[PDB]
């Protein structure tokens, strides 16, 4: 890999022959295949942008010309051409190379958000900034996938960009899951379609756009996984589960009920809805990267008498907040939302962690939110959600393997008592374990037992609204501690406190969960250990509170 | 006098063109008499007659985007006699209402959603085997600048399910982009005040048996030349004052420069006002881009509409630590525009945002001061929220303690019984509560924390000196300011009892702001009686 090890930055491409560029592209593909197989990450989407990224850095002068990747999962070649080729041994590892652009890593990186369809909106802003600061001849380049182009923010941005001569180059990276509408005749100059694996053709198209001195669309066609047949074959975004359990449960319920329909915002595979679609192909809708449309179209389906199940990863549901509020909840419609990747996900960094949903959903009048503690409770809570015919329901659960089943000692006022004070200890601490933190709560209760502190561990199952069961048990204990895989601001703990205070119960409450912060990438287990969300650190904390009385 | 003898749409079916021209004139006189959004309704008289001459509501659902222009629809569906009660408590809604009519589908005033509902309903009819239901979405040129329309059109374009997209274009503030060649059948432009031409175009669309755009051109206020407050005025004046001194300040509105107070800003600094269309999401992320280019954007979006921009505040502004100031007018109860207008979500939503700072001005001087403070934050998002309407006289403070303004303190001889944390617009009510409690021998410290989030050290310091903390907020209590104060105290190991007095987490029907507050017991009499109960306990 003689060619690649000589690239210090973009200008090192500037005097290469097409033969050298072709050799470099082959070295980049070999590098990506071997590095990304070792670390995991977005191999297919990066293989598809080798020639496109070489062409961008042969035409544009980054960062004078900002290169803004929509989503940013496809910026590995960009990082390799901006001095970070030696950092791939640490890709997506704690203290290592981010899976997304990072302002901390490089002057060439602008946007760290993985939330799709935002690049063109940043581009409009930056182009306006350059005008307002009198920066000469800065060309903002937005690299937008066909998937990202199905998001509404792109239409808002293109309307704004089209109103001005400020130079924004809209590079559509089309490997399609893309738009059903034409973007050849919107009033913006259109160049293409260009073969995105013909580096010279991409350079000519971009150079032509750069010289246009006004907004222009450059439509490039690429192949996801180009050069690596397994990635080409599977068209995969990256290389006993919660998701599988959801998938199987949903198929079970849809077998007994023709009114169930499923909706994904472009992630039928990862949400477990491909298996559902194979059994009920008329009842699965993939709406593109369009969480807002997923939710309001769900409202329309419910107005026509159906019970939509909308499966959207926790973090991405932020996009649909106003649709949950004004389209679903305002109309008392039975839409069930299923939020996979709830709580810390870790390795995709700050913009992927599912740590907002309990706080956001708590704002929605009349909402019912469940957090499954295990496989059986996911099945049961899904059935209970499907039985709610008069308002929105939500289930949230983490990525990865479902923990073993924990059967309750008893159910009181909706709440599952998982553990009660044993062998002469008293009702000291009510530990309210939200969702997947049940096993950690049981380990905390055992450590506290050994300190002489008696713990009742409950799973409220339905976290919102706060149930009678929680109020009934609270008054029997000296301290209530909520333990949640969610931001503590407006989270389950603050809701439990608010519900007790509303009921004139002033038992001391503590909110143990994620501090209201953006977390850098690391494994889930490393993020939780660094925050002290471990049975050892939580038991130590609760001991201090009980000692203080 | 035919309008009073229209029972529903079928009463138009056998009218002559001369009778339709008479009825349109009667509808225009009735609208002026009774109205609410007059201009938009005068613009859709012939369009609405034509819709109800072609489509069979509600077999053919007629969904108004935003729904402010559905008065003629109500008059043609048996509700003309109800206009005596328009936007009055227990009276006719300013928006479509499923409770009022089988002909009404969507009650949300939030623009650009109609096509998404239309997609879902069309899908439902297919899945339930309902024959020959044509969903009609009536979308304004403004509404069509919203991202939801692009998501909906992309989905609608993928299917033969009949959705008729009726574009009500009075902008020729609509799209800069062409919708004449998206892959969808396009009919028009049609003269929207030629009832017969509009029916011909619509009938063509109904018979097409696939999705179709019918482009209709209307004049807002048509037939009526005339159509052809203090808090906001204070914001406008203050922003102009700061921008005079600072070249880095830019203002952004999502299609509301006049009502947000930004027209006067644009008149002085025309290169520094951006109107992005009805595009709250783009407003916030373009703000992020402007801040990345070294500017300090001020984004003026009414409280309720800021819901749309939640993920852009989170992942585009806050994640990058960018200095965007959000200014939320119409914060708290607005009343007569009903459930989807009340600015009662913002303190709960903004509280989720890492590193956010949120101010709630108590008066004109504090709006000026807190805006100046926001403009000085260079490393993260700031927000100011204030109500619709006139602002009263300044409320003077006795002292500032850890950022917090003491508005009242217990009389010499009374104990420090209650810390009454008065958020923004409820300072006058908190001072009235304090005077009533004084008369019962109950000592009250009233504070305006000014910066509600994060909860200040001044709140923590005063809390430990009182027996009871009561927060009073013009916001939903779930995740609201009271719950945030409680959470901050408990985090600081302070277990002083806290009570969260504010709006229950409910959608409110239309009524005046005063009526809504009185019905919830948000009055100085009712709050003082509640606090008396707690103090006794
Ligand atoms: C990484 C991640 O979170 C991805 S990558 C991806 C597909 C992107 O398709 P596009 O065509 O734009 O790119 P391509 O990979 O080059 O084909 C999705 C749906 N997601 C999840 C997702 C969902 N919804 C939103 C709003 N943002 C993101 N990032
Ligand atoms: C009433 C209201 O809240 C209206 S009507 C309107 C302009 C509508 O323009 P359009 O061209 O669609 O309609 P026209 O009146 O027929 O011209 C706006 C900005 N708003 C406020 C607004 C802002 N943002 C959003 C998401 N929804 C609304 N309703
Ligand atoms: Mg793609
Ligand atoms: Mg209009």
Tab-separated table of C-alpha atoms in Angstrom, chain A residues 103 110-113 115 118 120-122 124-126 128-130 132-133 149-160 162-163 166 178-183 185-188 261 282-283 285-294 296-297 299-301 303-306 315 318-319 321-323 325-331 333 350-351 356 359-360 362-366 488-490 493-494 497-498 501-502 504-506 508-511 516-518 541 545, chain B residues 98 105-108 110 113 115-117 119-121 123-125 127-128 144-155 157-158 161 174-184 250 271-272 274-282 285-286 288-290 292-295 304 307-308 310-312 314-320 322 339-340 345 348-349 351-355 477-479 482-483 486-487 490-491 493-495 497-500 505-507 530 534:
chain	number	residue	atom	x	y	z
A	103	UNK	CA	-14.412	18.634	14.862
A	110	UNK	CA	-17.858	20.005	10.386
A	111	UNK	CA	-20.860	17.938	11.499
A	112	UNK	CA	-20.736	15.114	14.148
A	113	UNK	CA	-24.520	14.365	14.133
A	115	UNK	CA	-29.098	12.082	12.257
A	118	UNK	CA	-29.399	17.664	7.939
A	120	UNK	CA	-28.146	20.660	3.216
A	121	UNK	CA	-29.579	22.703	6.159
A	122	UNK	CA	-26.028	23.147	7.631
A	124	UNK	CA	-27.466	26.820	3.667
A	125	UNK	CA	-26.422	28.231	7.097
A	126	UNK	CA	-22.654	28.087	6.347
A	128	UNK	CA	-25.150	32.477	4.522
A	129	UNK	CA	-22.381	32.855	7.164
A	130	UNK	CA	-19.651	33.172	4.440
A	132	UNK	CA	-22.301	37.732	6.103
A	133	UNK	CA	-18.539	37.546	7.038
A	149	UNK	CA	-32.709	12.712	0.352
A	150	UNK	CA	-36.128	11.140	1.301
A	151	UNK	CA	-36.090	13.200	4.563
A	152	UNK	CA	-38.172	16.405	4.777
A	153	UNK	CA	-35.235	18.592	5.971
A	154	UNK	CA	-33.720	18.192	2.421
A	155	UNK	CA	-36.847	19.753	0.838
A	156	UNK	CA	-36.826	22.656	3.358
A	157	UNK	CA	-33.050	23.239	2.625
A	158	UNK	CA	-33.328	22.924	-1.207
A	159	UNK	CA	-36.213	25.499	-1.195
A	160	UNK	CA	-33.959	27.917	0.789
A	162	UNK	CA	-32.736	27.628	-4.616
A	163	UNK	CA	-33.762	31.174	-3.502
A	166	UNK	CA	-24.815	31.428	-2.766
A	178	UNK	CA	-34.281	6.604	-2.581
A	179	UNK	CA	-36.823	9.242	-3.751
A	180	UNK	CA	-39.886	8.117	-5.804
A	181	UNK	CA	-40.042	11.799	-6.979
A	182	UNK	CA	-37.844	13.334	-9.745
A	183	UNK	CA	-35.177	15.888	-8.581
A	185	UNK	CA	-36.607	19.501	-12.716
A	186	UNK	CA	-37.029	21.429	-9.362
A	187	UNK	CA	-35.602	24.774	-10.684
A	188	UNK	CA	-31.980	23.852	-9.625
A	261	UNK	CA	-49.804	-2.706	10.393
A	282	UNK	CA	-49.463	-5.724	2.476
A	283	UNK	CA	-49.089	-4.626	6.152
A	285	UNK	CA	-44.722	0.209	5.117
A	286	UNK	CA	-41.145	1.504	4.653
A	287	UNK	CA	-41.589	5.314	4.344
A	288	UNK	CA	-37.882	6.168	3.756
A	289	UNK	CA	-35.773	8.200	6.287
A	290	UNK	CA	-38.983	10.048	7.253
A	291	UNK	CA	-39.763	9.597	10.979
A	292	UNK	CA	-42.220	12.574	10.792
A	293	UNK	CA	-44.167	10.906	7.927
A	294	UNK	CA	-43.919	7.476	9.702
A	296	UNK	CA	-48.421	11.133	10.874
A	297	UNK	CA	-49.136	8.383	8.299
A	299	UNK	CA	-52.131	8.689	12.616
A	300	UNK	CA	-53.933	8.425	9.224
A	301	UNK	CA	-53.919	4.600	9.368
A	303	UNK	CA	-58.100	7.245	11.710
A	304	UNK	CA	-58.989	4.534	9.097
A	305	UNK	CA	-59.466	1.939	11.901
A	306	UNK	CA	-56.014	0.218	12.012
A	315	UNK	CA	-32.673	8.510	19.231
A	318	UNK	CA	-36.747	12.847	18.442
A	319	UNK	CA	-37.574	13.867	14.819
A	321	UNK	CA	-41.949	14.600	18.691
A	322	UNK	CA	-44.458	17.119	17.213
A	323	UNK	CA	-46.185	14.335	15.199
A	325	UNK	CA	-48.023	15.286	20.106
A	326	UNK	CA	-50.358	16.922	17.543
A	327	UNK	CA	-51.135	14.116	15.023
A	328	UNK	CA	-51.349	10.991	17.305
A	329	UNK	CA	-51.967	12.087	20.940
A	330	UNK	CA	-54.236	15.123	20.168
A	331	UNK	CA	-56.623	12.743	18.264
A	333	UNK	CA	-55.279	7.471	18.231
A	350	UNK	CA	-23.412	10.876	21.283
A	351	UNK	CA	-26.032	11.080	18.465
A	356	UNK	CA	-34.046	10.993	25.438
A	359	UNK	CA	-38.084	12.387	28.929
A	360	UNK	CA	-39.614	13.320	25.538
A	362	UNK	CA	-43.371	12.048	29.288
A	363	UNK	CA	-44.442	15.455	27.758
A	364	UNK	CA	-47.188	13.799	25.595
A	365	UNK	CA	-50.686	14.093	27.210
A	366	UNK	CA	-52.276	10.693	27.935
A	488	UNK	CA	-32.268	11.954	34.276
A	489	UNK	CA	-33.629	15.388	33.199
A	490	UNK	CA	-37.423	14.853	32.864
A	493	UNK	CA	-37.017	9.170	38.309
A	494	UNK	CA	-38.190	12.832	38.032
A	497	UNK	CA	-40.896	12.057	42.310
A	498	UNK	CA	-43.454	14.395	40.616
A	501	UNK	CA	-45.392	14.901	45.433
A	502	UNK	CA	-48.724	15.314	43.494
A	504	UNK	CA	-48.704	14.404	48.975
A	505	UNK	CA	-46.000	11.693	49.475
A	506	UNK	CA	-42.670	13.312	50.481
A	508	UNK	CA	-37.068	11.135	49.674
A	509	UNK	CA	-36.565	10.299	45.932
A	510	UNK	CA	-33.243	9.995	44.046
A	511	UNK	CA	-32.904	9.791	40.214
A	516	UNK	CA	-27.922	14.909	30.857
A	517	UNK	CA	-24.801	14.902	28.615
A	518	UNK	CA	-23.614	13.844	25.138
A	541	UNK	CA	-24.325	5.526	46.587
A	545	UNK	CA	-28.163	8.056	51.243
B	98	UNK	CA	-64.071	15.484	14.780
B	105	UNK	CA	-60.581	14.769	10.296
B	106	UNK	CA	-57.565	16.757	11.615
B	107	UNK	CA	-57.756	19.259	14.563
B	108	UNK	CA	-53.965	20.041	14.591
B	110	UNK	CA	-49.445	22.518	12.881
B	113	UNK	CA	-49.195	17.382	7.974
B	115	UNK	CA	-50.477	14.886	2.940
B	116	UNK	CA	-49.041	12.500	5.593
B	117	UNK	CA	-52.541	11.888	7.064
B	119	UNK	CA	-51.129	8.743	2.766
B	120	UNK	CA	-52.121	6.840	5.950
B	121	UNK	CA	-55.901	7.104	5.285
B	123	UNK	CA	-53.413	2.999	2.959
B	124	UNK	CA	-56.155	2.224	5.560
B	125	UNK	CA	-58.932	2.271	2.851
B	127	UNK	CA	-56.220	-2.476	3.775
B	128	UNK	CA	-59.949	-2.417	4.842
B	144	UNK	CA	-45.935	23.144	0.984
B	145	UNK	CA	-42.494	24.629	2.082
B	146	UNK	CA	-42.538	22.155	5.029
B	147	UNK	CA	-40.445	18.967	4.927
B	148	UNK	CA	-43.422	16.729	5.868
B	149	UNK	CA	-44.960	17.446	2.369
B	150	UNK	CA	-41.808	16.094	0.638
B	151	UNK	CA	-41.841	12.897	2.803
B	152	UNK	CA	-45.621	12.479	2.080
B	153	UNK	CA	-45.336	13.192	-1.693
B	154	UNK	CA	-42.433	10.718	-2.047
B	155	UNK	CA	-44.621	8.025	-0.359
B	157	UNK	CA	-45.908	8.995	-5.639
B	158	UNK	CA	-44.913	5.303	-4.999
B	161	UNK	CA	-53.852	4.953	-4.252
B	174	UNK	CA	-44.523	29.425	-1.146
B	175	UNK	CA	-41.867	27.052	-2.630
B	176	UNK	CA	-38.889	28.401	-4.658
B	177	UNK	CA	-38.795	24.829	-6.168
B	178	UNK	CA	-41.004	23.541	-9.084
B	179	UNK	CA	-43.699	20.882	-8.263
B	180	UNK	CA	-44.759	20.784	-12.019
B	181	UNK	CA	-42.388	17.785	-12.771
B	182	UNK	CA	-41.908	15.507	-9.640
B	183	UNK	CA	-43.284	12.394	-11.483
B	184	UNK	CA	-46.864	13.254	-10.303
B	250	UNK	CA	-28.752	37.339	12.586
B	271	UNK	CA	-29.078	41.112	4.980
B	272	UNK	CA	-29.456	39.700	8.571
B	274	UNK	CA	-33.831	35.008	6.973
B	275	UNK	CA	-37.433	33.811	6.459
B	276	UNK	CA	-36.992	30.064	5.732
B	277	UNK	CA	-40.702	29.268	4.989
B	278	UNK	CA	-42.799	27.013	7.311
B	279	UNK	CA	-39.601	25.084	8.070
B	280	UNK	CA	-38.825	25.122	11.827
B	281	UNK	CA	-36.385	22.191	11.328
B	282	UNK	CA	-34.395	24.081	8.636
B	285	UNK	CA	-30.140	23.563	11.505
B	286	UNK	CA	-29.375	26.573	9.209
B	288	UNK	CA	-26.383	25.723	13.481
B	289	UNK	CA	-24.577	26.391	10.133
B	290	UNK	CA	-24.609	30.169	10.693
B	292	UNK	CA	-20.426	27.298	12.683
B	293	UNK	CA	-19.532	30.314	10.434
B	294	UNK	CA	-19.028	32.499	13.556
B	295	UNK	CA	-22.453	34.235	13.824
B	304	UNK	CA	-45.773	25.304	20.251
B	307	UNK	CA	-41.760	21.047	18.975
B	308	UNK	CA	-40.944	20.461	15.248
B	310	UNK	CA	-36.546	19.249	18.924
B	311	UNK	CA	-33.965	16.967	17.167
B	312	UNK	CA	-32.284	19.982	15.432
B	314	UNK	CA	-30.459	18.479	20.242
B	315	UNK	CA	-28.163	17.123	17.523
B	316	UNK	CA	-27.347	20.197	15.326
B	317	UNK	CA	-27.112	23.069	17.922
B	318	UNK	CA	-26.440	21.512	21.403
B	319	UNK	CA	-24.173	18.607	20.303
B	320	UNK	CA	-21.827	21.153	18.586
B	322	UNK	CA	-23.189	26.397	19.188
B	339	UNK	CA	-54.999	22.700	22.142
B	340	UNK	CA	-52.366	22.820	19.309
B	345	UNK	CA	-44.393	22.145	26.122
B	348	UNK	CA	-40.309	20.376	29.405
B	349	UNK	CA	-38.791	19.816	25.903
B	351	UNK	CA	-34.973	20.706	29.754
B	352	UNK	CA	-33.942	17.506	27.831
B	353	UNK	CA	-31.231	19.412	25.890
B	354	UNK	CA	-27.710	18.930	27.323
B	355	UNK	CA	-26.070	22.219	28.435
B	477	UNK	CA	-46.034	20.213	34.817
B	478	UNK	CA	-44.657	16.899	33.377
B	479	UNK	CA	-40.881	17.560	33.099
B	482	UNK	CA	-41.238	22.636	39.137
B	483	UNK	CA	-40.033	19.038	38.424
B	486	UNK	CA	-37.279	19.303	42.636
B	487	UNK	CA	-34.729	17.239	40.636
B	490	UNK	CA	-32.752	16.188	45.373
B	491	UNK	CA	-29.442	15.992	43.384
B	493	UNK	CA	-29.365	16.258	48.780
B	494	UNK	CA	-32.058	18.917	49.653
B	495	UNK	CA	-35.377	17.182	50.528
B	497	UNK	CA	-40.997	19.394	50.127
B	498	UNK	CA	-41.592	20.743	46.555
B	499	UNK	CA	-44.957	21.200	44.776
B	500	UNK	CA	-45.308	21.766	41.001
B	505	UNK	CA	-50.398	17.598	31.138
B	506	UNK	CA	-53.559	17.816	28.982
B	507	UNK	CA	-54.746	19.314	25.679
B	530	UNK	CA	-53.843	25.356	47.926
B	534	UNK	CA	-49.820	22.497	52.326
